[PDB]
């Protein structure tokens, strides 16, 4: 599906927070909050070169 792995509002936190620069989910009190988002290496992300 062309939607898979891109239904998130994640933004990279930037350097200076002792964490990588991969985009991350916002908010609180969920458990998904602060995870990896779009990336191809990220759980629940998007696959490399989605099959067309």
């Amino acid at each position: 599906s062309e939607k898979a792995g891109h239904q998130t509002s994640a933004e990279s936190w930037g350097t200076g927070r002792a964490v990588a620069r991969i985009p991350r989910v916002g908010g609180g009190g969920t458990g998904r909050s602060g995870q990896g988002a779009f990336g191809n290496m990220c759980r629940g992300g998007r696959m490399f070169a989605p099959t067309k």
């Binding site: 609180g28 009190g29 969920t30």
Partner: peptide, 17 residues
């Protein structure tokens, strides 16, 4: 769950110049 934030910021002084 545990929300997190920018730990300290500032209070690091300045260096050389």
């Amino acid at each position: 769950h545990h929300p997190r934030y920018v730990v300290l910021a500032s209070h690091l002084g300045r260096m050389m110049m």
